[PDB]
Amino acid sequence: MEISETNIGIFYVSKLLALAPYSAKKNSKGQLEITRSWLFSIYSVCLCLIMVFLTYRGLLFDANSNIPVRMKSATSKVVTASDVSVVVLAIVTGVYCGMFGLRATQELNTRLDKIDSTLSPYNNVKKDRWRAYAMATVSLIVIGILLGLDVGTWVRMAQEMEDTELNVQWYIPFYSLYFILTGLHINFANTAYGLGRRYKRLNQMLRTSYLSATKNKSLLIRAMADNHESLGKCVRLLSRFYGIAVLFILVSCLLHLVATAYFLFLEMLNKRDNGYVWVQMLWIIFHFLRLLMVVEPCHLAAREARKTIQIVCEIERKVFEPILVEETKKFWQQLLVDDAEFSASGLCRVNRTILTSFASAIATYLVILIQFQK
Amino acid sequence: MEISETNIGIFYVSKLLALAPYSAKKNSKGQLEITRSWLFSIYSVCLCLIMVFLTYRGLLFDANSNIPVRMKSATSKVVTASDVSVVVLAIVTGVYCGMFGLRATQELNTRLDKIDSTLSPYNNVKKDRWRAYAMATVSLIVIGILLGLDVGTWVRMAQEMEDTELNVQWYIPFYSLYFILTGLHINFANTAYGLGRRYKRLNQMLRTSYLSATKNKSLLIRAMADNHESLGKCVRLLSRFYGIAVLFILVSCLLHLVATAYFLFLEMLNKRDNGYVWVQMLWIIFHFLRLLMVVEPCHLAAREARKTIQIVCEIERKVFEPILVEETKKFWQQLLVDDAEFSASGLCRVNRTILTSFASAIATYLVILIQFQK
Amino acid sequence: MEISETNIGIFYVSKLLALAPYSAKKNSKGQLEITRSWLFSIYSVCLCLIMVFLTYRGLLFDANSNIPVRMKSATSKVVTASDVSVVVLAIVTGVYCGMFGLRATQELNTRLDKIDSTLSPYNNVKKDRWRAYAMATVSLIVIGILLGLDVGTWVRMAQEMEDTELNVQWYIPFYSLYFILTGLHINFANTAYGLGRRYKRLNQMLRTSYLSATKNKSLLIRAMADNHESLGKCVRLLSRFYGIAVLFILVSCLLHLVATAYFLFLEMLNKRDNGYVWVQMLWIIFHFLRLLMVVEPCHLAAREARKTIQIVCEIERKVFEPILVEETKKFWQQLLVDDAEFSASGLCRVNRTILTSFASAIATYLVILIQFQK
Amino acid sequence: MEISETNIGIFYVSKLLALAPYSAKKNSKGQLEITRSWLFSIYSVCLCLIMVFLTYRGLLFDANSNIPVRMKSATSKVVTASDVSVVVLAIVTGVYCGMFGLRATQELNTRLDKIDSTLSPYNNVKKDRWRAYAMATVSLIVIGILLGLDVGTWVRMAQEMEDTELNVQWYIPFYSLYFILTGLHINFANTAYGLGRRYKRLNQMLRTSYLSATKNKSLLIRAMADNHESLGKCVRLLSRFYGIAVLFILVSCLLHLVATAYFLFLEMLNKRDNGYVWVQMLWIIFHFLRLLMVVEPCHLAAREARKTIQIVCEIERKVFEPILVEETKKFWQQLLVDDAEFSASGLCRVNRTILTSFASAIATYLVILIQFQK
Ligand SMILES: OC[C@H]1O[C@](O)(CO)[C@@H](O)[C@@H]1O
Ligand SMILES: OC[C@H]1O[C@](O)(CO)[C@@H](O)[C@@H]1O
Ligand SMILES: OC[C@H]1O[C@](O)(CO)[C@@H](O)[C@@H]1O
Ligand SMILES: OC[C@H]1O[C@](O)(CO)[C@@H](O)[C@@H]1O
């Protein structure tokens, strides 16, 4: 995860949501330093364990309730349990990654500091801060009104048939855990989008400074080679930090994209109220947007990294000095060798192609289950 | 999309079908210039919106009609809605690509002009114009008689049980939108086939001029290197212009190849008239041909681009001059680096392998659905 | 397809089976010449058309017979029609490839002649002839007793309930077409195995002559580079000749591996005679062996082609002369560039990985269909 | 398989379990020599044949018993037969690989001896021996208590309804064969983990000795190039030795991960005793751990092999001598050329991506079968 004074609200939100128990303390030479927060580590572990235990306790309390609200069936129980358990797994993986990842975070931030140090000409900070804050605020607000609307529609259905108020607020830990899931998505989307933006700036350096004695050109070549190595290693560091968390996030998103669609189809077939149908449509849209927050930044970063050698050849021809050509040859050898694709801890490569495979899964399941219903 | 006086009827047809609101005006130095047509942009947006609203209005009017003609079932409604909605999505994506794509079209045509400028020896214009016009006319005619036959068979079935004339002409916007889909297929097939033909000419240059002082050979090497870069970038420009349109076209084609087959199987099982069965067989053949108009040109272009280094090695050995060998080394470095595969906006690579995967999908669905029917 | 005096019986059998209407006439300078046989081309087209029409006529005659023997059901009809039609498609594709492939065959044989010309030290002809003749004889004999056993078991079942003799010999064209399918498999297996054996000899040249003035070493380097180009181009020529025929062969083999397994499962569930069960087990084994006659030779050829640069590096280090090192550098550049994987006309790459995918299909279908039966 | 005095207990256990009929005899010059044990080869073949015949005899004896214990159904019979037969196939493949693999084992051990000879600085033997012995003991113990618990729960269920003691001990050969399967897993996990650890040491050599006259640096470069070749060839030797055994192990693991899950779901639906449910949960966990003993070591080895050129570039820049740079260029050419991914005899590449595909299979089957049950 990325820690910087460009956008420190994201780090504070992640720490609040028990996903980054860290401390951001400066020294005199700038260089924001990330240290382990022992007071916040125990807070994160306690909050994660308490929230998971609470949502599971509410889950089995609804299951054992006299009139169940959310899980009253042989199949509704299984699907609701799968949804809650996959959300719990995503939360636990995010907390585990944020806890035992201090060294990876420190190394990634140290590399990013040197990356930003030599990217001055197109280092526009205000726009980056505004974009990051807007993305975080929009994500938190959309999930806030989504959880509020979900509470409202479930309250409406429960009151349709202490009545049910405690039965429906038994899922408050579930929505609190959804909040932590949104925070984890915010963190990963910020880090990957920052890596992609730095790759864009790296591509821009060679695109404008060269395709427009002279040892400054050789210095720029060496600095950009170091920058491309640092970005390629930062992608690997991110894959070490949130690789399994992103895997479980993708699994949760696929499971939700299947289960919410199945619930919407069943509810439409039963010819019930329009509120639950609209809420499930909003949930499907939100799940699609959530999926377009992990595959999209990784795809952008990989595509921008791949677009460096294709411009490096241009300097390879548009050079005459015997030293700068050798330097560009080394850079070309790098880009022939380097590969900066995000990996979900080695199981899969996160990019837009997943969007196809997920569909190839969903269009399968939605073809099977529906045909079993009718 | 490609604009040239070699075949200007395709551009005029695309502009008529609300898919290319552009103006082709020359200057004195040849160089056909493509400008944004503000009068035609509003016409395109109005036609697209009106056509989509009209086909949807007819869709729900048939659904709410006293005796529905095309959608009278719980499953027929869903499948017909899926077909109409996927056609609508393809049309909307094509219009959106043709509207917000002026810069990409201008850059692609500017690059293609320089490509054709230095490909004189095998620049045969009359055959290219005849082939493009024949392909466009055949596509439009086949879809015309197909829509006419579909109107006829649906009229026959509707009259089998204002009677039904307004109910059956409620789908005239649907067939008008199918016409725009055919026009979009024509446009993409023309552009991709032109890129492939230029790749073939590029391969022919090095295949005949070298495998048969002398600085003309070095000049030809440099010109062909520039040509291969321009073609590789033109493939990327096309992937930027029609990348998502081709994705939605492939999705529509897969959905139709499944739905038309399911309808044919159901209709054969019900033992009804032979006209609808033959019309659906023709529709399946047309959908297969439509699929063999996006994967086929992209596959041809990629295969012809891949067949350049495999001939570049021949000059790499069949050269003696110290400068021409270095030039061929740079060209070889390009072809080792370059990749000219069309991408459907990053989700998938369009080639003949899709034909396999589509089958692996269809043979799945046609195995499931049929087993659910029997 | 490969024509040589090393094994001319395979070519004669292929010509007899309407799969190679060619003439093998020598000139004084050795160099067996393949010419188009106009007398045999019309024979091949007539035999193919007559056989296809005859098997289809018998198919619909059994379907319309008073007591059908092989197709008396709603599903048995469909599965039997699929089997017969896929066999017919394979036969038609093989005949079409053998007819409009004179130029490809001539070029492939011309390249193979030069390949064998400079592979003298390990050119062992008697073993190659014996292996090819044994493979062809074993394939023909196994299919002969398989068709005989199939005739016997179907006669037994038909007589269990002109009685049925004409109804059961209505499928004699089907088994005659199976004979042509076996001949096509023999042809492709001979050609691909010859390409693989020549790749093995090429790998052996560099493995023994170098890893054991001296311009003979440079001559050997140049000759082996030419040989590797000729083999890589011969693989492409074979992919042009039998690319679609191999695709339809793989489709037929997958369809048969599914259908025969489904029939065996159904017959075991019905608790009928053991003869049909054993015949279907033999048919499944034969279909598996048939599949291990297209993926196996292509996989062997690709694996042996890939094992050339991995030994080329050895000479790259074990050389001292400034000219031989440059020659080995060119050879290494080839093997870095070259790719000699057989392609089924671009849809898929034929290798052992298909064996996995086929299973991933079969284990799917055999899981679905069976669960639908019980 | 790896034979060394570092861990000789694994070899002795494998020989005892009829998976390595070899003899480890030293000569005076160290260099542990592996010879074929004719006394142990016949013992291995007899034990394998007797065990397979015994488990099959017990299988059909339970099937033909008056009151079947494990297979009393139309589907339970099929699933139990599939499990037992896939275990038998894995055992037979392991025995066949261990018998006809003397040359491959000898070559692999000879290469590994030279690998370990020049890896002295980080050659820590005590930790390697402790880790290997602990892994083997833990695997054997976990499978021992698992088979004991399985015997106990099956005895409990059988006594719930000579009573059944001989019927339940009719599966003692099945659990004895499971022991041999565990031994095969131990052998492959030891060999692949040793290859990965040697790759780690190779990566460490260049990571510490260079990234910290001088011909010792060139000597180290040459030695590490030879080491990387030897490791790449040792991976190929392992793929030759246990390639098909690992394929059948993966097939068995997938079949078990599906069948045990189906049994657990059915047993939970039937609302039976908790002991069988907990035993099946333990079996699922053990099968997952077994799967994380073939994909995990191969993935680690491939990932560590891929992390060599990415550090080789560092010496490529951090060198000044004209000879050491040329040596590093040759090493870079290797790592650009080399590929050290384990292959299951060419059908598939064993890595963590399989974990995804297996899930994509399981999540399919568990979606189908369950929907067929309800
Ligand atoms: O409660 C929120 C979660 O449960 C569902 O609403 C099920 O209807 C899912 O769509 C969503 O992920
Ligand atoms: O109306 C044309 C469209 O609707 C169908 O005819 C359904 O029968 C499809 O085959 C076709 O794509
Ligand atoms: O007639 C031979 C063909 O038909 C079947 O026997 C069906 O039982 C198939 O197994 C085989 O391919
Ligand atoms: O007997 C052990 C084997 O049989 C099962 O227990 C079936 O319940 C499997 O889980 C296991 O692989």
Numbering used by the authors:
A (entry chain B), B (entry chain A), C (entry chain D), D (entry chain C): 1 to 161, 166 to 216, 263 to 424
What does the primary publication say about this deposited structure?
While mammals use G protein-coupled receptors (GPCRs) for sweet and bitter tastant perception, insects such as fruit flies use a unique family of proteins called gustatory receptors (Grs). To unravel the overall structure of these receptors and their unique structure features that define sugar specificity, we determined the cryo-electron microscopy (cryo-EM) structures of Drosophila mojavensis Gr43a (DmoGr43a) (given its better biochemical behavior than Drosophila melanogaster Gr43a (DmGr43a)) and Drosophila melanogaster Gr64a (DmGr64a) in apo or sugar-bound states. As expected, both DmoGr43a and DmGr64a form tetramer, and are topologically similar to each other, and to Orco from Apocrypta bakeri and odorant receptor 5 from Machilis hrabei (MhOR5)11. The structures of DmoGr43a and DmGr64a can be separated into a TMD with 28 transmembranes (TMs) in total (7 TMs in each subunit, numbered as S1–S7), and an intracellular domain (ICD) containing an “anchor domain”, following the nomenclature of Orco/MhOR510,11.
Among different sugars tested, e.g., 100 mM maltose, arabinose, glucose, trehalose, and fructose, only fructose activated DmoGr43a, with a measured EC50 of 42.97 ± 4.69 mM and ~30 mM in electrophysiology and calcium imaging respectively. Fructose, a pentose, adopts a conformation that its five-membered ring is roughly perpendicular to the membrane surface in the fructose-bound DmoGr43a structure. Accurate modeling of bound fructose in DmoGr43a was confirmed using molecular dynamic (MD) simulations, where fructose molecules remained stable. When glucose was placed in the densities, they also have a high probability of stable binding in the pocket according to the MD simulations, in line with the observation that glucose could bind but not activate BmGr9. Binding of fructose in DmoGr43a is achieved by formation of hydrogen bonds and hydrophobic interactions between residues in the binding pocket and various groups of fructose. Notably, Arg 70 from the S1–S2 loop, which is disordered in the apo state, becomes well-resolved in the fructose-bound state, and travels downward for fructose binding. Residues participating in fructose binding are generally very sensitive to mutagenesis, as most mutations rendered the channel non-responsive to fructose at up to 300 mM concentration. In DmoGr43a, Phe 313 from S5, which is directly involved in fructose binding, moves ~1.6 Å towards fructose, together with the whole S5. When the protomer structures of sugar-bound DmoGr43a and DmGr64a were aligned, it shows that these two sugar molecules do not overlap with each other, with the bound fructose molecules positioned closer to the pore in DmoGr43a, and the bound sucrose molecules in DmGr64a positioned further away from the pore. Therefore, sugar-bound structure of DmoGr43a and DmGr64a are likely in desensitized or pre-open states.
